[PDB]
Enzyme design. Structure first.
Site, PDB file in Angstrom:
ATOM      1  N   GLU A  74      -5.861   6.961   6.698  1.00 44.93           N
ATOM      2  CA  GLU A  74      -6.555   5.918   5.949  1.00 44.93           C
ATOM      3  C   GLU A  74      -6.710   4.650   6.780  1.00 44.93           C
ATOM      4  O   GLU A  74      -7.736   3.969   6.700  1.00 44.93           O
ATOM      5  CB  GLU A  74      -5.809   5.620   4.652  1.00 44.93           C
ATOM      6  CG  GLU A  74      -5.889   6.747   3.644  1.00 44.93           C
ATOM      7  CD  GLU A  74      -5.152   6.437   2.361  1.00 44.93           C
ATOM      8  OE1 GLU A  74      -4.299   5.528   2.371  1.00 44.93           O
ATOM      9  OE2 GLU A  74      -5.430   7.101   1.341  1.00 44.93           O
ATOM     10  N   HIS A 126       0.823  -1.204   0.000  1.00 48.23           N
ATOM     11  CA  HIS A 126       0.000   0.000   0.000  1.00 48.23           C
ATOM     12  C   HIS A 126       0.860   1.258   0.000  1.00 48.23           C
ATOM     13  O   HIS A 126       0.535   2.243  -0.675  1.00 48.23           O
ATOM     14  CB  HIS A 126      -0.933  -0.016   1.206  1.00 48.23           C
ATOM     15  CG  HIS A 126      -1.922   1.103   1.216  1.00 48.23           C
ATOM     16  ND1 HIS A 126      -1.974   2.037   2.226  1.00 48.23           N
ATOM     17  CD2 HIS A 126      -2.892   1.443   0.337  1.00 48.23           C
ATOM     18  CE1 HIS A 126      -2.937   2.904   1.971  1.00 48.23           C
ATOM     19  NE2 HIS A 126      -3.509   2.567   0.830  1.00 48.23           N
ATOM     20  N   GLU A 146       1.858   1.790  -3.470  1.00 51.45           N
ATOM     21  CA  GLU A 146       0.758   2.335  -4.259  1.00 51.45           C
ATOM     22  C   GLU A 146       0.652   3.840  -4.064  1.00 51.45           C
ATOM     23  O   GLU A 146       0.485   4.593  -5.027  1.00 51.45           O
ATOM     24  CB  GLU A 146      -0.552   1.651  -3.875  1.00 51.45           C
ATOM     25  CG  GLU A 146      -1.780   2.215  -4.570  1.00 51.45           C
ATOM     26  CD  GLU A 146      -3.071   1.712  -3.965  1.00 51.45           C
ATOM     27  OE1 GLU A 146      -3.020   0.764  -3.156  1.00 51.45           O
ATOM     28  OE2 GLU A 146      -4.138   2.266  -4.289  1.00 51.45           O
ATOM     29  N   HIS A 147       0.743   4.297  -2.815  1.00 50.81           N
ATOM     30  CA  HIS A 147       0.682   5.734  -2.563  1.00 50.81           C
ATOM     31  C   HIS A 147       1.903   6.459  -3.113  1.00 50.81           C
ATOM     32  O   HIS A 147       1.801   7.625  -3.504  1.00 50.81           O
ATOM     33  CB  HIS A 147       0.548   6.009  -1.069  1.00 50.81           C
ATOM     34  CG  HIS A 147      -0.867   6.056  -0.592  1.00 50.81           C
ATOM     35  ND1 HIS A 147      -1.494   7.230  -0.239  1.00 50.81           N
ATOM     36  CD2 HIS A 147      -1.781   5.074  -0.415  1.00 50.81           C
ATOM     37  CE1 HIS A 147      -2.732   6.970   0.138  1.00 50.81           C
ATOM     38  NE2 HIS A 147      -2.932   5.669   0.042  1.00 50.81           N
ATOM     39  N   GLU A 204       3.925  11.073   3.430  1.00 51.36           N
ATOM     40  CA  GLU A 204       2.702  10.307   3.246  1.00 51.36           C
ATOM     41  C   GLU A 204       2.356   9.442   4.443  1.00 51.36           C
ATOM     42  O   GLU A 204       1.298   8.807   4.442  1.00 51.36           O
ATOM     43  CB  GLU A 204       2.813   9.417   2.005  1.00 51.36           C
ATOM     44  CG  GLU A 204       2.457  10.116   0.710  1.00 51.36           C
ATOM     45  CD  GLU A 204       1.000  10.535   0.647  1.00 51.36           C
ATOM     46  OE1 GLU A 204       0.133   9.748   1.078  1.00 51.36           O
ATOM     47  OE2 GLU A 204       0.723  11.654   0.168  1.00 51.36           O
TER      48      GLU A 204
END
Ligand SMILES: CCCCCCCCCCCCCCCCCC(=O)OC[C@H](COP(=O)([O-])OCC(O)COP(=O)([O-])OC[C@@H](COC(=O)CCCCCCCCCCCCCCCCC)OC(=O)CCCCCCCCCCCCCCCCC)OC(=O)CCCCCCCCCCCCCCCCC
Ligand SMILES: CCCCCCCCCCCCCCCCCC(=O)OC[C@H](COP(=O)([O-])OCC(O)COP(=O)([O-])OC[C@@H](COC(=O)CCCCCCCCCCCCCCCCC)OC(=O)CCCCCCCCCCCCCCCCC)OC(=O)CCCCCCCCCCCCCCCCC
Ligand SMILES: CCCCCCCCCCCCCCCCCC(=O)OC[C@H](COP(=O)([O-])OCC[N+](C)(C)C)OC(=O)CCCCCCCCCCCCCCCCC
Ligand SMILES: CCCCCCCCCCCCCCCCCC(=O)OC[C@H](COP(=O)(O)OCCN)OC(=O)CCCCCCCCCCCCCCCCC
Lengths: 88, 41, 48, 476, 85, 55, 66, 101, 455, 98
Positions: free
Chosen positions: D150, D70, D73-74, D143
């Site tokens: 999230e 993940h 992905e970010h 991030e």
């Protein structure tokens, strides 16, 4: 009975191929006069896999880059289905 | 009564098996006009 | 487009399933009954 | 209620199932010598979905880099060597399109919906982000908080938390049983640029990537673009082939303040590529689904068995009647979650917690397990036909729109190696025997260890031991 | 930068990112500051339980037929003794 | 006749050979069957068998 | 096999089949009809052989006993 | 000339059918203990022979309308039990066509 | 084949199959048309839009909803939403639903579409929906009700659950309810879509029967199909004996028009004290900032509004979407007959945010023909996405017919989006900003923005 | 779209009888309750006795071809496609009952 349609093993590093499939078999006894056995290796088919194998033999023996086909476990063999003729 | 047939039309029973159509057995899915009517649409 | 059945209709197939003369012996141009040591048995032989 | 009910006297007409089989254009597929695959299904229209499907989810993490997928992905959206984040967003906006990234346990995908005139630019941007994206530490540190938010947001989705519990309980000791986002302590401190680079290098290889096109697209153009951009991917090491052991057990979260209780019970099944895949799908459709708006109109033996005990007056000879005040079931749904190695086949029940120390959930699970045993022993022909027809329709209902068709193409290409033609699939669906279905049901349900996940008032949900003792019967 | 005359990115930064209000902060009494007085785990950690209690995996037997067979066979003598007695 | 043309064409074609005579790279059937049994799941037991078993 | 009663009634001399609504079995004691199904000797064998099956299956207890 | 039926329920070691066969006729201890000699190769289609006969055939396999005829469902039985099947079938079909022409 | 004791598999290929230079091919025909409409002589209207797909949807549209209620009947339509689906006179709930569900048909939960009609939708293979039994069951449901007291009790439970769940799990949908309630203050569009607490005890079988008598009439029923050939549909809904056994009457219902307040204005609920905080959001305030926009009555202005809404939505929502992106904003455009709302619903809204949104809308006002091309293209991408989906086709047909009474296929909307003009969008925005705003607050916090602080 | 073509509602249900009560009720009238006397009703209640009921007549309707006044009434009503004849479901019996 319903098993897999016949396929073609192909070994990459050795570069050697060969057809294969599941052969049913039963204990031998008297036969039936009014019955010609159906297609048992390729069930529910008009038996085109023989034609596909015959057509594809030249393709396979000539050397096929089958890196886009699934492997069989951890060995060097990949399965090519004989549903349609192989051209690549 | 089960599945009662309607009408006495032809069924391929033991006594009657009919006359084979070798032309359709051989020319299966292939047109006949390429051989009987060459070069015509 | 399908007509009433008739015995000489376009959709009648040869009778090769149902056996009629069981105890016949097929006759015609046939290979010699050669015998070899170790070769696979021929399909059309009495031995399997 | 003075109005009579003529439905109890009338003769009703039964609709019958008759399928519609529209011939779709065949799904073409090619493979570069590198092994990167290119699949395409074309249809008349004006818009097309173009995407890249990658066969590297969170299934390949060892709790030291959990959530690295993940994070990657970010990080792909934070700019590349050529473009910046602003430039990528500007390109997408000029095309009037959105770039969607989805990450699952064993698949990731980056796809764009566009016009047929923006296909080359979309493929260019996809290749740019996937291959040439620079992932520096500074951005990695910028991030972390968004990913923490999230994590806190996805922790608030009861269904997702329940499925995470089910997977954590079933597959302990392997990455398949870890959460997609990962531990919070991993989000804030542990995941690093080194881990991200290792993950990308190991899992973004040629033979594990496909370029999928759906809709008004040209297969030849797609192949040319794929050779131009994706021809240089390495032929890295093969996908890991380990043993993922299934551990029967239970994961129960206690929250007595919740208004509803969620209980998922699952059994181990073989993978998606096993020959039993179609039989397991037919079983899933045989158990069926039920929603509260139906009332007593449950069309399956399973759901019905669990629902009619809240409408039964329960009058007995020596005991007082005990009829439930109202039906507490919110929903029942049969699910199958397959993976290249294993699977989880089971049911998911949502119902009110009910009076403390009641019998509602005892009855629900009693009848659920009884129905599992019954289908393991015998299945009726009419329900077999119903299940097969429902599987046909369900398989067809998932192919709505170019994006959904592309998703199906990509998933099947990554799993089976090529998309199975629907007719071919249906050809295998009419060849299933009731005896074969019974054998499959008995192999995996009868006297087996289940995995249970519970969220809600665990005061009333039976514990694992009892549930383990109802997977078999004395009579058999 | 301007998509059809709109500085969309700017607008996004001013409109597309509202602040998120999280859980209220609970003031901690000074006697709960020591970590062990605010537990987060039971007795055994996963690692421990993964080294002592879980059986060794048998990749040829992914359905525990071995464990089921052994347990039922080992129960048989109990029933046998009770019946004979 | 078309029959004569076809017969002559086939006769000339078989002079070149047939796949059973011209194919070089081709595995024995025993190796393929052993690989089938040792790697692929049995269509009855739905698991991978070591070798060929009658029952 | 399946009864031919529709044809028999719609046939050419239906008065001959009025008896067929009395206590009377069709196969044994009714006038045969031009379009009747062909009856075989051992119907079990006749129906099983063309499908490749021997008439009796040992796995079925009833067949084994018979 | 035999249809095995359901392969699944007859492959088990112990079965009602096998016990009945032992009691009345057709099966016995010689089959359990020695299957190599009393079951042996068994009766069924031969994949190896079918492949050999297919690969021995000339281009007549491509040019034959056999696969669309109503007898396409008997393809393997004839390919195995009729050596040189496709060449003969091709000559038969070309004979029909030339009669037609 | 067609023989006795002959192998069923002994059949050749079909007569529509050809073999040419090897691999075989198939011969077939062509089908399909555009959008088609008809009216039965008893008043019922049928709309069909075939697209050649194998999956079809059939919707019975029944005219009843909040716009037809008053302050004493508030929420009665919600009961009508379910009461009609429960046991009827000639077919109970068990008989119909199971009979449809065992026939490979997905039965959807009835819905209220534009606050003015109830859609009963069924989904399945076209061949299964074309048979005259499914339509017969729907006719039975709509024409011969029973309204049994026990079913009404069940419906009361269902409506209570629906209101509570929407409030807890769909705070944005509840915010939309508040937005309309206060937007159209003293007009039919301002009625509530949820049953108010008091009426939960009041509505019963007698009230339901009185409402059914008031709303009875074949003129209040429509049929809409999306992947069924038109004629087949006519062959399905006209074979029912129950339609022939029903009183023949064309009875219409009409509702007035609406005006627009909304407001710097507020619905107070302490969510942190109402629900458990773990699996729902309880620390947020939901602000909907809305303006008046044209409805579907004028197709040109509707297309301009669609372009404006797409431009606003794309300029706020992220371009690069990740898997677990949270839901914090929504740009909505609710279009009705001759009036509509366009706005931004958000959490933890701010005066700066709302000022930026208004300025963005004004900037959209001043765009030129060249600058409008990008936003027109984005709107066209969305419109084509709607065109390619049967669910979206059904939604568009139902909305277009319900609001205006004139159907409108999604493809037609495409033709209207690429005819949009800079002058049209300028006039539309001038209309939007020439009326007061709706700063419909809902939530709890006291730091919420206020209209005097914006304008 | 803008034009609504007019289609007849139920053409299949014109020119069918619509009078309730119909004429069949006059022909197949049972003013004396059940049409079968006690003994008859006693013999049709058992599968064995039923065989004796018709076997007493050496040449009479068998138990399969025998019909009653009520059965003929229902058949006559169904044959004439009367609009107001709502068909009734025969009593369906499960295994044990049979
Ligand atoms: C509540 C109903 C539960 C139930 O289904 O009981 C069926 C009951 C037990 O079956 P079960 O619940 O499947 O238990 C089987 C377990 O393997 C039993 O294994 P276990 O590990 O659970 O051991 C406990 C088991 C046996 O172990 C013990 O009781 C402990 C050892 C003996 C202690 C005394 C010395 O206890 C019993 O059998 C108790 C029987 C009394 C009713 C419960 O069935 C019978 O007793 C026989 C049924 C058939 C004959 C008819 C009998 C009634 C007339
Ligand atoms: C006690 C023993 C009684 C005699 C043997 C009975 C065996 C069957 C028992 C049984 O449970 O059968 C159920 C079984 C039910 O049939 P299913 O399999 O459900 O099929 C329904 C239909 O049958 C539809 O199936 P289907 O029509 O295709 O028939 C199946 C096929 C199946 O058959 C076969 O596949 C083989 C048949 C071989 C027939 C002979 C062919 C030529 C020789 C070949 C070599 C084999 C020799 C025999 C075996 C030894 C080999 C070393 O044929 C038969 O099963 C019957 C064929 C004729 C043989 C039995 C004749 C019994 C009546 C005559 C009694 C008098 C003579 C015997 C001594 C008493 O019954 C039958 O199949 C037979 C029909 C009923 C026969 C009885 C008729 C009334 C007889 C009254 C007089 C009785 C004797 C005098 C008593 C006096 C007072 C004490
Ligand atoms: C009924 C109440 C509930 C009981 C539940 C179960 C209790 C716990 C399990 C049983 C434990 C004891 C088993 C003893 C077995 C060994 C002895 C035996 O039977 O030998 C067989 C042998 C069998 O002998 P035979 O004669 O049959 O053998 C043939 C020998 N030839 C051919 C050479 C002649 O001896 C006997 O049976 C002798 C008579 C019976 C002896 C009984 C012994 C005591 C039983 C109770 C002990 C338990 C505790 C006390 C309970 C008191 C209750 C009032
Ligand atoms: C000696 C030990 C015998 C008892 C142990 C069990 C033996 C095996 C099971 C009994 C049934 C025999 C096997 C089943 C069958 O159908 O057998 C047919 C058999 C004819 O075959 P046969 O010539 O015996 O072949 C072996 C050659 N030595 O012929 C028969 O079946 C005839 C009747 C049974 C004969 C039993 C004796 C051994 C036969 C081998």
């Amino acid at each position: 009975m319903n098993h897999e349609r016949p396929w073609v093993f192909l070994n990459k590093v050795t570069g050697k191929w060969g057809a294969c499939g599941w052969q049913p078999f039963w204990k031998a006894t008297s036969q039936s006069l009014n019955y010609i056995p159906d297609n048992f290796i390729a069930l529910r088919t008009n038996g085109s896999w023989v034609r596909n194998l015959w057509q594809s033999s030249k393709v396979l023996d000539r050397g096929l880059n089958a890196s886009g086909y699934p492997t069989v476990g951890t060995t060097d063999w990949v399965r090519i289905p004989l549903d349609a003729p192989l051209e690549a | 009564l089960g599945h009662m047939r309607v009408g006495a039309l032809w069924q391929s029973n033991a006594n009657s098996r009919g006359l084979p159509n070798l032309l359709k057995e051989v020319m299966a899915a292939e047109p006949i006009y390429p051989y009987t009517h060459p070069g015509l649409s | 487009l399908h007509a009433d059945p008739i015995f000489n209709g376009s959709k009648v197939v040869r009778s090769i399933q149902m056996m009629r003369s069981y105890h016949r012996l097929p006759v015609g141009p046939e290979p010699p009954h050669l015998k070899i040591r170790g070769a696979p048995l021929h399909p059309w032989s009495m031995y399997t | 209620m003075t109005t009579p009910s003529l439905s109890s006297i009338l003769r009703h007409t039964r609709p019958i199932f008759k399928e519609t089989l529209r011939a779709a254009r065949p799904t073409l597929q090619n493979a570069l010598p590198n092994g990167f695959r290119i699949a395409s299904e074309s249809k008349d229209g004006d818009t097309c979905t173009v995407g890249v499907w990658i066969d590297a989810g969170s299934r390949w993490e060892t709790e030291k880099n959990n959530g690295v997928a993940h994070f990657l992905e970010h990080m792909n959206f934070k700019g590349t060597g050529k473009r910046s984040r602003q430039d990528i967003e500007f390109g997408m906006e000029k095309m009037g399109a959105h770039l969607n990234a989805y990450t699952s346990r064993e698949h990731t995908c980056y796809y764009v919906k566009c016009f047929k005139k923006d296909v080359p630019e979309a493929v260019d941007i996809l290749a740019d982000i996937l291959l040439n994206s620079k992932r520096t530490e500074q951005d990695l540190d910028a991030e972390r908080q968004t990913i923490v938010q999230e994590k806190e947001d996805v922790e608030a989705r009861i269904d997702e938390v329940l499925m995470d519990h089910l997977h954590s309980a079933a597959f302990e000791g392997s990455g398949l049983g870890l959460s997609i986002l990962g531990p919070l302590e991993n989000i804030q401190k542990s995941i690093t640029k080194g881990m991200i680079d290792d993950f990308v290098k190991t899992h973004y290889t040629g033979p594990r990537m496909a370029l999928v096109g759906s809709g008004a697209v040209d297969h030849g153009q797609l192949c040319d673009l794929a050779s131009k951009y994706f021809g240089a991917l390495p032929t890295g090491q093969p996908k890991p082939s380990g043993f993922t052991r299934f551990l029967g057990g239970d994961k129960r979260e206690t929250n007595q303040l919740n208004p509803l209780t969620h209980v998922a019970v699952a059994f181990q099944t073989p993978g998606i590529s096993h020959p039993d895949a179609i039989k397991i799908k037919v079983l899933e459709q045989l158990l069926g689904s039920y929603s509260r708006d139906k009332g007593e109109a449950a069309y399956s033996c399973f759901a019905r068995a669990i629902v009619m005990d809240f409408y039964d007056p329960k009058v007995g000879q020596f005991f007082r009647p005990n009829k439930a005040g109202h039906n507490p079931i919110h929903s029942l749904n049969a699910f199958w979650a397959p993976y290249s190695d294993v699977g989880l086949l089971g049911f998911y029940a949502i119902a009110e917690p009910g009076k403390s120390y009641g019998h509602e959930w005892e009855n629900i699970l009693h009848y659920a397990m009884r129905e599992l045993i019954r289908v393991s022993r015998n299945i009726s022909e009419e329900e077999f036909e119903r299940a097969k027809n429902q599987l046909k329709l369900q398989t067809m209902l998932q192919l709505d729109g170019t994006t959904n068709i592309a998703d199906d193409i990509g998933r099947q290409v990554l799993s089976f190696g090529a998309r199975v033609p629907l007719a071919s699939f249906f050809e295998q669906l009419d060849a299933i025997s009731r005896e074969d279905l019974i054998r499959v049901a008995h192999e995996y349900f009868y006297d087996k260890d289940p995995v249970v996940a519970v969220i809600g008032d665990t005061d009333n949900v039976p514990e694992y031991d009892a549930l383990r003792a109802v997977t078999y019967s004395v009579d058999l | 930068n301007a998509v059809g005359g709109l500085a969309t990115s700017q607008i996004r930064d001013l409109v597309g990112n509202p602040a998120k209000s999280g859980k209220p902060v609970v003031k901690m009494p000074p006697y709960l500051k020591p970590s062990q007085l605010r537990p987060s785990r039971g007795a055994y950690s996963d690692e421990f339980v993964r080294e002592n209690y879980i059986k060794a995996a048998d990749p040829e037997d992914p359905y525990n037929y071995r464990s089921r067979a052994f347990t039922y066979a080992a129960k048989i003598p109990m029933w046998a003794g009770l019946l004979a007695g | 006749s078309p029959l004569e043309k076809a017969i002559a064409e086939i006769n000339e074609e078989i002079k070149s050979g047939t796949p059973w005579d011209t194919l070089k790279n081709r595995a024995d059937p025993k190796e393929l069957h052993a690989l089938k049994f040792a790697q692929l799941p049995h269509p009855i037991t739905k698991k991978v068998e070591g070798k060929f078993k009658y029952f | 096999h399946g009864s031919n009663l529709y044809n028999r009634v719609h046939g050419n001399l239906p008065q001959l089949y009025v008896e067929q609504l009395y206590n009377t079995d069709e196969i044994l004691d009714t006038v045969p009809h031009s379009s009747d199904p062909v009856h075989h000797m051992f119907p079990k064998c006749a129906a099983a052989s063309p499908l490749g099956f021997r008439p009796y299956d040992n796995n079925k207890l009833w067949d084994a006993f018979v | 000339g035999t249809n095995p039926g359901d392969i699944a329920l007859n492959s088990k070691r112990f079965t009602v059918g096998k016990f009945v066969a032992w009691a009345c006729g057709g099966w016995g201890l010689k089959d359990w203990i020695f299957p190599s000699l009393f079951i042996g190769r068994g009766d069924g289609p031969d994949f190896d022979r079918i492949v050999k006969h297919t690969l021995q055939s000339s281009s007549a396999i491509e040019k034959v309308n056999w696969f669309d005829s109503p007898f396409a469902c008997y393809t393997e039985w004839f390919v195995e039990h009729f050596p040189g099947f496709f060449d003969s079938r091709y000559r038969f079909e070309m004979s029909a066509k030339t009669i037609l022409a | 084949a067609l023989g006795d004791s002959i192998n069923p598999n002994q059949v050749g290929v079909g007569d529509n199959v050809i073999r040419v230079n090897g691999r075989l091919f198939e011969v077939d025909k062509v089908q399909e048309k555009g959008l088609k409409t008809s009216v039965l002589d008893n008043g019922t209207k049928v709309i069909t839009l075939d697209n050649g797909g194998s999956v079809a949807q059939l919707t019975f549209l029944y005219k009843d909803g909040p716009v037809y209620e008053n302050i004493f009947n508030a929420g009665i339509s919600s009961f009508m939403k379910h009461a009609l689906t429960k046991d009827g006179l000639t077919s109970s709930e068990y008989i119909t639903k199971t009979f449809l569900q065992k026939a490979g048909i997905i039965v959807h939960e009835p819905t209220v579409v534009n606050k003015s009609a109830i859609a009963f939708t069924v989904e399945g293979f076209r061949d299964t929906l074309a048979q005259p039994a499914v339509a017969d069951k729907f006719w039975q449901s709509l024409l011969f009700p029973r309204f049994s007291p026990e079913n009404v009790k069940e419906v009361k439970r269902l409506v209570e659950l629906e209101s509570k769940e929407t409030k807890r799990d769909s705070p944005f949908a509840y915010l939309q309810d508040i937005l309309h309630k206060t937007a159209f203050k003293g007009s039919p569009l301002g009625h509530t879509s949820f049953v108010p607490a008091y009426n939960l005890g009041y509505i019963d079988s007698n009230k339901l029967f009185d409402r059914w008598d008031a709303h009875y009439g074949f003129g209040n029923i429509a049929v809409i199909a999306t992947n069924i050939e038109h004629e087949a549909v006519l062959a399905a809904i006209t074979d029912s004996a129950w339609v022939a056994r029903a009183h023949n009457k064309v009875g219409g219902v009409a509702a007035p028009a609406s005006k627009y307040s909304g407001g710097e204005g507020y619905d107070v609920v302490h969510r942190a004290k109402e629900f458990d905080d773990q699996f729902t959001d309880v620390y947020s305030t939901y602000t909907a900032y809305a303006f008046k926009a044209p409805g579907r009555s004028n197709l040109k202005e509707h297309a301009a509004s669609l372009v404006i809404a797409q431009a606003l939505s794309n300029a706020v929502s992220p371009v690069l979407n990740t898997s677990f992106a949270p839901k914090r904003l929504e740009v909505f455009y609710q279009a009705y007959d001759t009036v509509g709302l366009i706005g931004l619903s958000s959490v933890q809204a701010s005066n700066a945010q709302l000022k930026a949104f208004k300025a963005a809308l004004s900037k959209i006002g001043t765009l030129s023909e060249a600058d409008l091309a990008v936003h027109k293209s984005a709107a066209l991408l969305t419109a084509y996405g709607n065109v390619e989906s049967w669910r979206a086709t059904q939604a568009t047909l139902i909305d277009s017919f319900n609001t205006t009474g004139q159907p409108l296929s999604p493809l037609e909307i495409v033709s209207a989006i690429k005819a949009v003009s800079a002058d049209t969008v300028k006039s539309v925005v001038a209309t939007m900003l020439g009326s007061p705003a709706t700063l419909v607050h809902h939530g709890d916090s006291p730091c919420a923005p206020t209209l005097d602080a914006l304008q | 779209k803008r034009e609504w073509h007019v289609v007849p509602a139920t053409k299949k249900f014109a020119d069918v009888p619509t009078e309730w009560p119909a004429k069949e009720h006059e022909r197949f009238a049972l003013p004396y309750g059940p049409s079968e006397g006690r003994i008859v009703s006693f013999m049709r209640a058992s599968r064995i006795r039923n065989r004796l009921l018709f076997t007493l007549n050496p040449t009479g309707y068998t138990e399969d071809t025998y019909v009653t006044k009520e059965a003929l009434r229902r058949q006559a009503l169904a044959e004439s496609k009367n609009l107001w004849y709502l068909p009734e479901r025969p009593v369906v019996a499960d295994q044990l009952e049979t």
